[PDB]
Design a protein around this motif. Structure first.
Motif, mmCIF file in Angstrom:
data_model
loop_
_atom_site.group_PDB
_atom_site.id
_atom_site.type_symbol
_atom_site.label_atom_id
_atom_site.label_comp_id
_atom_site.label_asym_id
_atom_site.label_seq_id
_atom_site.Cartn_x
_atom_site.Cartn_y
_atom_site.Cartn_z
ATOM 1 N N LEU A 150 0.825 -1.212 0.000
ATOM 2 C CA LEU A 150 0.000 0.000 0.000
ATOM 3 C C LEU A 150 0.861 1.265 0.000
ATOM 4 N N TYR A 151 1.956 1.278 0.763
ATOM 5 C CA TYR A 151 2.821 2.458 0.755
ATOM 6 C C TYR A 151 3.473 2.651 -0.600
ATOM 7 N N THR A 152 3.823 1.551 -1.271
ATOM 8 C CA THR A 152 4.349 1.676 -2.631
ATOM 9 C C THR A 152 3.338 2.363 -3.540
ATOM 10 N N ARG A 153 2.084 1.912 -3.510
ATOM 11 C CA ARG A 153 1.042 2.505 -4.351
ATOM 12 C C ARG A 153 0.774 3.946 -3.949
ATOM 13 N N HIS A 154 0.736 4.215 -2.649
ATOM 14 C CA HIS A 154 0.536 5.579 -2.193
ATOM 15 C C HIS A 154 1.618 6.491 -2.763
ATOM 16 N N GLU A 155 2.886 6.079 -2.619
ATOM 17 C CA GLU A 155 3.983 6.936 -3.052
ATOM 18 C C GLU A 155 3.932 7.153 -4.558
ATOM 19 N N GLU A 157 6.972 19.232 0.848
ATOM 20 C CA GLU A 157 7.079 19.014 2.288
ATOM 21 C C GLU A 157 6.497 17.660 2.673
ATOM 22 N N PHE A 158 5.325 17.343 2.156
ATOM 23 C CA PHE A 158 4.708 16.081 2.525
ATOM 24 C C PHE A 158 5.518 14.887 2.027
ATOM 25 N N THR A 159 5.990 14.910 0.771
ATOM 26 C CA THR A 159 6.744 13.733 0.317
ATOM 27 C C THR A 159 8.044 13.589 1.105
ATOM 28 N N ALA A 160 8.604 14.693 1.603
ATOM 29 C CA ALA A 160 9.760 14.573 2.497
ATOM 30 C C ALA A 160 9.394 13.810 3.771
ATOM 31 N N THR A 161 8.262 14.152 4.378
ATOM 32 C CA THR A 161 7.863 13.474 5.608
ATOM 33 C C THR A 161 7.449 12.037 5.333
ATOM 34 N N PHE A 162 6.939 11.767 4.128
ATOM 35 C CA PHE A 162 6.620 10.390 3.753
ATOM 36 C C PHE A 162 7.876 9.518 3.756
ATOM 37 N N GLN A 163 9.022 10.077 3.358
ATOM 38 C CA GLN A 163 10.264 9.316 3.409
ATOM 39 C C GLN A 163 10.618 8.998 4.846
ATOM 40 N N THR A 164 10.413 9.947 5.758
ATOM 41 C CA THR A 164 10.644 9.641 7.169
ATOM 42 C C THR A 164 9.787 8.463 7.602
ATOM 43 N N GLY A 165 8.498 8.499 7.259
ATOM 44 C CA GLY A 165 7.641 7.383 7.610
ATOM 45 C C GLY A 165 8.128 6.091 6.989
ATOM 46 N N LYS A 166 8.570 6.158 5.732
ATOM 47 C CA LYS A 166 9.102 4.971 5.059
ATOM 48 C C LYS A 166 10.328 4.422 5.789
ATOM 49 N N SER A 167 11.231 5.304 6.197
ATOM 50 C CA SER A 167 12.419 4.840 6.913
ATOM 51 C C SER A 167 12.036 4.179 8.217
ATOM 52 N N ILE A 168 11.068 4.753 8.932
ATOM 53 C CA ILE A 168 10.662 4.169 10.204
ATOM 54 C C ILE A 168 9.952 2.832 9.984
ATOM 55 N N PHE A 169 9.057 2.772 8.988
ATOM 56 C CA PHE A 169 8.406 1.513 8.644
ATOM 57 C C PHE A 169 9.427 0.441 8.313
ATOM 58 N N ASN A 170 10.435 0.775 7.523
ATOM 59 C CA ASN A 170 11.449 -0.232 7.198
ATOM 60 C C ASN A 170 12.155 -0.746 8.453
ATOM 61 N N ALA A 212 6.513 5.608 16.825
ATOM 62 C CA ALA A 212 7.086 6.734 16.096
ATOM 63 C C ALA A 212 6.368 6.952 14.776
ATOM 64 N N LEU A 213 6.012 5.861 14.096
ATOM 65 C CA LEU A 213 5.362 5.978 12.801
ATOM 66 C C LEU A 213 3.968 6.576 12.936
ATOM 67 N N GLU A 214 3.273 6.260 14.034
ATOM 68 C CA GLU A 214 1.991 6.892 14.328
ATOM 69 C C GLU A 214 2.141 8.404 14.444
ATOM 70 N N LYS A 215 3.220 8.857 15.082
ATOM 71 C CA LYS A 215 3.402 10.289 15.280
ATOM 72 C C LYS A 215 3.787 10.973 13.974
ATOM 73 N N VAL A 216 4.629 10.332 13.161
ATOM 74 C CA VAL A 216 4.959 10.916 11.860
ATOM 75 C C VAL A 216 3.697 11.080 11.028
ATOM 76 N N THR A 217 2.819 10.077 11.056
ATOM 77 C CA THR A 217 1.598 10.097 10.249
ATOM 78 C C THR A 217 0.619 11.149 10.736
ATOM 79 N N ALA A 218 0.399 11.211 12.053
ATOM 80 C CA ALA A 218 -0.508 12.217 12.585
ATOM 81 C C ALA A 218 -0.009 13.627 12.282
ATOM 82 N N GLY A 242 1.645 14.499 9.809
ATOM 83 C CA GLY A 242 1.526 14.752 8.381
ATOM 84 C C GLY A 242 0.152 15.201 7.946
ATOM 85 N N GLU A 243 -0.863 14.966 8.767
ATOM 86 C CA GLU A 243 -2.214 15.175 8.278
ATOM 87 C C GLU A 243 -2.549 16.649 8.116
ATOM 88 N N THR A 244 -1.871 17.541 8.841
ATOM 89 C CA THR A 244 -2.046 18.967 8.584
ATOM 90 C C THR A 244 -1.634 19.318 7.153
HETATM 91 C C1 LIG Z 1 5.228 4.900 5.839
HETATM 92 C C2 LIG Z 1 4.825 5.638 4.611
HETATM 93 O O1 LIG Z 1 3.594 6.362 4.820
HETATM 94 C C3 LIG Z 1 3.572 7.545 5.426
HETATM 95 O O2 LIG Z 1 4.625 8.031 5.891
HETATM 96 C C4 LIG Z 1 2.346 8.270 5.533
HETATM 97 C C5 LIG Z 1 1.058 7.804 5.236
HETATM 98 C C6 LIG Z 1 0.546 6.515 4.721
HETATM 99 N N1 LIG Z 1 0.199 8.852 5.519
HETATM 100 N N2 LIG Z 1 0.855 9.929 5.980
HETATM 101 C C7 LIG Z 1 2.174 9.616 6.014
HETATM 102 C C8 LIG Z 1 3.156 10.638 6.475
#
Ligand SMILES: CCOC(=O)c1c(C)n[nH]c1C
Length: 126
Positions: free
Chosen positions: A45-50, A74-87, A107-113, A115-117
């Motif tokens: 799902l993260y692959t498809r999202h990205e 900005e958001f795709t930068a934070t998505f990489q953080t989430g990706k690194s933490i997920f990995n 930590a991944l919960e906090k990165v995601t929350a 990000g929602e702004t």
């Molecule tokens: C782990 C990859 O996904 C995300 O980081 C992510 C999703 C999904 N939603 N919001 C963020 C920041």
């Protein structure tokens, strides 16, 4: 449109939220076989999202939607953080290390929350 593609991206992101919360319950219950499958599904799902997010950002660039491009950068930068933490979470699961898994999960919960702004600002800029 860029906006309908963003709505799909938002739906795929919510699918990941749903699967992630089912996985967290399974992890807490000790159902490691379920966790393994949920983690594989989350990666897919993260692959498809990205993939959707990148096509949206590239389209906003071609359209010259400067505010949307800024926000998506900005958001795709934070998505990489989430990706690194997920990995790292996945690696902790492979290693049989529930302490680190718990930490990364949190930590991944906090990165995601956080990000929602951004995510909601993008929707309104596109
Ligand atoms: C782990 C990859 O996904 C995300 O980081 C992510 C999703 C999904 N939603 N919001 C963020 C920041």
């Amino acid at each position: 449109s860029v906006k309908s593609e963003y709505a799909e991206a938002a739906a795929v992101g919510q699918e990941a939220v749903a699967v992630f919360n089912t996985m967290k319950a399974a992890f807490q219950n000790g159902d490691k076989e379920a966790v393994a499958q949920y983690l594989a599904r989350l990666a897919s799902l993260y692959t498809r999202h990205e993939e959707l997010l990148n096509r949206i950002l590239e389209k906003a660039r071609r359209e010259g939607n400067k505010e949307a491009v800024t926000l998506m950068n900005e958001f795709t930068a934070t998505f990489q953080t989430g990706k690194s933490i997920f990995n790292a979470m996945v690696a902790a699961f492979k290693n049989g290390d529930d302490d680190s898994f718990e930490s990364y999960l949190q930590a991944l919960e906090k990165v995601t929350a956080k990000g929602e702004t951004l995510a909601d600002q993008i929707a309104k800029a596109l």
